[PDB]
Design a protein around this nucleic acid. Structure first.
Ligand SMILES: [Zn+2]
Ligand SMILES: [Zn+2]
Ligand SMILES: [Zn+2]
Ligand SMILES: [Zn+2]
Length: 109
DNA sequence: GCGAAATGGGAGGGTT
DNA sequence: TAACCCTCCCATTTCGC
């Protein structure tokens, strides 16, 4: 785990440093305040500085949930949302809250 | 209402 | 170069009861 960040931001007063030039060029859009990637869903009008941020956001509109829990078959749109959910099973036949297995799990969604 | 859990966004990291 | 996906932090919202 190295800390050498050779790419420094040239913005006046900014001390940001990054390991890769792509990370620095991605940071430079924060000073310009430009957010060109706008969500065109109804009654949203949200916008982001990065295209991947817009695609992550638009999954809440499209209902795309590629990540599925191997224990209770619950689906999530993000990998970190799935990993956090799996902690509910570590502490605690039906693995859904308040219910007494694949058919039952699939019917919950 | 309470705590837990889910949700959503920023920021940064890697892989092509 | 940058699209693309992952990982962590954080505040807010929703759920379970
Ligand atoms: Zn900067
Ligand atoms: Zn939207
Ligand atoms: Zn689960
Ligand atoms: Zn059940």
């Amino acid at each position: 785990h190295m800390e050498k960040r050779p790419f420094m931001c040239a913005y006046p007063g900014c001390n940001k440093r990054y390991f890769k030039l792509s990370h620095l060029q991605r940071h430079s859009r924060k000073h310009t305040g430009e957010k060109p990637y706008q969500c065109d869903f109804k009654d949203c009008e949200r916008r982001f500085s990065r295209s991947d941020q817009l695609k992550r956001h638009q999954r809440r509109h499209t209902g795309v949930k590629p990540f599925q829990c191997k224990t209770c078959q619950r689906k999530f749109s993000r990998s970190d949302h799935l990993k956090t959910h799996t902690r509910t099973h570590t502490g605690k036949s039906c693995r859904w809250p308040s219910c007494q297995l694949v058919r039952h799990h699939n019917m919950h969604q």
